[PDB]
Amino acid sequence: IMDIPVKLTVELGRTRMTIKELLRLTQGSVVALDGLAGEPLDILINGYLIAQGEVVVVADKYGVRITDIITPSERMRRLSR
Amino acid sequence: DLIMDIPVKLTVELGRTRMTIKELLRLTQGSVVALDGLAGEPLDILINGYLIAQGEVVVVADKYGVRITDIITPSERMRRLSR
Amino acid sequence: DIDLIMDIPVKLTVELGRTRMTIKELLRLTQGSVVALDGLAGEPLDILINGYLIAQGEVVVVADKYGVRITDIITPSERMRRLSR
Amino acid sequence: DIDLIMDIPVKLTVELGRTRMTIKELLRLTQGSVVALDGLAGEPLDILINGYLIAQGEVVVVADKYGVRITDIITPSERMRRLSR
Amino acid sequence: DLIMDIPVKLTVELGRTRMTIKELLRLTQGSVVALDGLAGEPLDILINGYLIAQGEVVVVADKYGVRITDIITPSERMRRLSR
Amino acid sequence: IMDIPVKLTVELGRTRMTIKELLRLTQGSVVALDGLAGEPLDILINGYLIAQGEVVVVADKYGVRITDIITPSERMRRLSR
Amino acid sequence: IMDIPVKLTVELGRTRMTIKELLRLTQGSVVALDGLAGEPLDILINGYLIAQGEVVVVADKYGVRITDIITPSERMRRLSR
Amino acid sequence: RRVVRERLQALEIINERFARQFRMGLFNLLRRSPDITVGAIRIQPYHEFARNLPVPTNLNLIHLKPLRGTGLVVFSPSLVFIAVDNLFGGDGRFPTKVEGREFTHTEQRVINRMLKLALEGYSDAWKAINPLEVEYVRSEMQVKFTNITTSPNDIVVNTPFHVEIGNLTGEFNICLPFSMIEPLRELLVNPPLENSRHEDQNWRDNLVRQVQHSELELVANFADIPLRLSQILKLKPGDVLPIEKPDRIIAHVDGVPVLTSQYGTVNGQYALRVEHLINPI
Amino acid sequence: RRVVRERLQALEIINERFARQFRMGLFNLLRRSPDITVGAIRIQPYHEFARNLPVPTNLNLIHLKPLRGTGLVVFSPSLVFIAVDNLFGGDGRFPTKVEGREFTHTEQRVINRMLKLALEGYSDAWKAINPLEVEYVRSEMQVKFTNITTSPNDIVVNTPFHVEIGNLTGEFNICLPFSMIEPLRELLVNPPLENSRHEDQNWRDNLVRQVQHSELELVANFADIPLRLSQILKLKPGDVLPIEKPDRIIAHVDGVPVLTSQYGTVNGQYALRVEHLINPI
């Protein structure tokens, strides 16, 4: 009920390999992730997820186009992934 | 290095904003929220929630690929955690 | 390169045992039901991280506090043998 | 330059401990609820100013009056190690 | 100097006025109050509520920048506190 | 209820760094703060905040354009800043 | 009642002989099975059968044309085979 | 920055059946059998569609309740000319081309008949699967005045059609915002499914009867301690790591927890005493 | 000294939809479709706007209850000439220019029709989001007589529009004081939001359900003593600093206090005994 500021978190994709694949890749090396072009992004608070939503840019400033609160159904599957 | 071949989880973020729960209360399910980092600045790159480096995404080979640019730089890491 | 990675937090997991079991059995299970595991009593428990095999160990109660004591580091050959089951 | 700054009042702060806790837990908490902290009993308390690490110390009751006695000055290397957690 | 790198909080003020609570009582939420210092005089600069020096703001680089002009000058500081 | 004069205080912006950045800067050095052009100013009494309001100048004399009493909501956030 | 992801399995035909017939056959050797062209395919979950159904390909991606849940009648005979 | 990708199955069949319905409707209307060639479904931003749109041409707004937003349809001047002369029985071998000149009252009225006929055809075709009412809003001349999408870069879906009557040919398009179908994004991808009769649900129940025969592998967890790989490297066999009190055991399969349990010593085996199934509802 | 900066989102869309409404209103009024080009929203002092205003031109006062102050609209002599000749059906290819000459009675009456039509259009457009009644007050010839703002340097917001009918063109502006929208300064910045249905609040409640799963780090404070950095420099490890009696402990997260508590010795650990949550209400 009582209000307080809190730290949020947005995550752009997750993959699974050793750092040495990218550690060998010096600066300027482009690397892709499971993140592709079009899918929405999730929001975390203090590292705890909330909701799904795309992010756009306005006035040279990013703006999240949030969609809906993440239910435990898809929360479980994204935790599993 | 006998544990070199261990997969790791990385985390890439856009930006932060000090946001009180009264704001989310009026934030609808289709609301728009900004961040602190300006557009065009390379995204910060982390692993398992731990800061590593920064990079920027580019539309290459029909997939979002992030171009690594900086190193851990522990002095800069200390400066960053000293905010 | 190696020095950069050293100061990085990582997670770890430990498993007790494995048993074949189907949804009929789990629905039949009720409050207080007892289920065993293939892990024999006293057998050292496997130790993994992020689902990746690391080592094996056993829990020892030192100063009325639970603590797992490892015993070995899995060789690549024995890891291959274990996964080839 | 240095002499100009010396006679300037400054603030200081001391912290007891840290615990992970969520709004569910705080709402469940009621009057008289007891909450612990990671700071072990008898452990010296960290001393900071304006949120900036300074030193560590412990409280000593001298002439039935509370007083904090410092024990060390944080080196830059140990400060970096502490912030790298 | 082992504590050189310590951030500090500064305070910049316009002017003062001896103001009795009966005046604020008739002062509405959209009222206007004057000060003691005349327009154009450099603003006093303080840190953590402690007098340091004075300066004036100038519209430079689309941001309010104050131009430091004087030093602590402890004799003048004593004269100022002797009011 | 009983009346008495009291000392007020107006604050033009606050930043966070060491004095040596400005101590090295000799007299005549311009330095900016979080204070920008347009935002209102707060009023303190004996160092205790009251209200938010811009300040204008009239007859070569500054005049505060106070707006409203500061509520604890924004009081807390400005204390945090 | 409670939901969980689970591993499926589809099986394309079964035969009975020693591996040495095919072990002698090096790579690139074509070998046929009881599976012919036209008959539907069965689906297993964790190795446990469910239903009968053909599989087609759409958008360069396979798609099963499932037909009906396998009853114990034909389940027994396919186990016997 | 604006990117969307997807693959669709059902709306292709929907467009085909609506095209057959529209073909027979035009046949009975103009006493002559037409032919409609449905083009490949187009996914493009609104600005790209507007650029590809041949000006001049008539655009019409048809709302789709209860989904917020309005649908759009377009018809070529060649199509309206050919349709109106066939209504008059004209051969069309001496055609005329009008550019910039707004449609007359009679031409707009003929457009109104095409609009109502197309609305009825698409209404029946769409309600054959999903009941979504279509209601005309307002015709428009210039695409910029339509301003349906929030941004010109907003990606929209367009269905092209090639309609001919003998020698006479033509082409018209049906374009829709992707936000119009965003709530039904999963449905349009899925191909149409028949049956749905009462025996279809017990068929699903038959599948459930098959499902009870399943194999599940549980995972038992005791400690999940965060450490450092430097500590792991300096760790050696025989090292001990303290663990907090595991007041309960979480049981999960491939990740998903199902219950909590208490460990116990049973018949010389590591056994667990379940407490209750985890129900997220 | 007078400075204001900001960025706006919603009023752009509001102006666009009002412009479409005004375009269709003028179309039905003059039996000819016009075109309105909305210029970039202008933020400038009142004196700057007056200087940029092309004299002669007609200015009109429209009050906006319950917000104190009056809104302003302007129309060009070219626009009024073109509109009135189109009302008479004149081609306008032999135009006339009048400067300094006040509008006749008939010209002022035609201006009255434009004023009422624009008032109705903006009323519906604005009430589509926020209900704020607009009521005309008094037309004005010279900008100095309008004297709406307290000072000429008072920064005002103006919305320019470019209106044409075929070859005939024109431009009129809608300028508003910033104090007119100062109470709604936060609202105009925010882009328009849809829904607001009953499921929108429980959607916010759904977000709250997500919020209960949050991580919070508390801060415990014992002594906040004001000292001098000279004393800090002369301080050496082993030094002791007296502290008054901490009758209670303040607990805050990132600064914001939430409760008060009493320290205690529990299970060999520094534990605190909470008293009550801090409620500022």
UniProtKB/TrEMBL annotation, chains H, I:
Q: Which residues form the Flagellar motor switch protein FliN-like C-terminal domain?
A: 210-278
Write the protein's name: Flagellar motor switch protein FliM
GO CC terms:
bacterial-type flagellum basal body; plasma membrane
Q: Which locations, inside or outside the cell, does it occupy?
A: Cell inner membrane; Bacterial flagellum basal body
Keywords for this protein: Bacterial flagellum, Cell inner membrane, Cell membrane, Cell projection, Chemotaxis, Cilium, Flagellar rotation, Flagellum, Membrane
* Function noted in UniProt: FliM is one of three proteins (FliG, FliN, FliM) that forms the rotor-mounted switch complex (C ring), located at the base of the basal body. This complex interacts with the CheY and CheZ chemotaxis proteins, in addition to contacting components of the motor that determine the direction of flagellar rotation.
Membrane topology listed for this record: Peripheral membrane protein
Q: What family does this belong to? A: Belongs to the FliM family.
- Which terms does the record give in the GO molecular function aspect? cytoskeletal motor activity
- The answer, when asked if rRNA-binding is one of the entry's keywords, is no
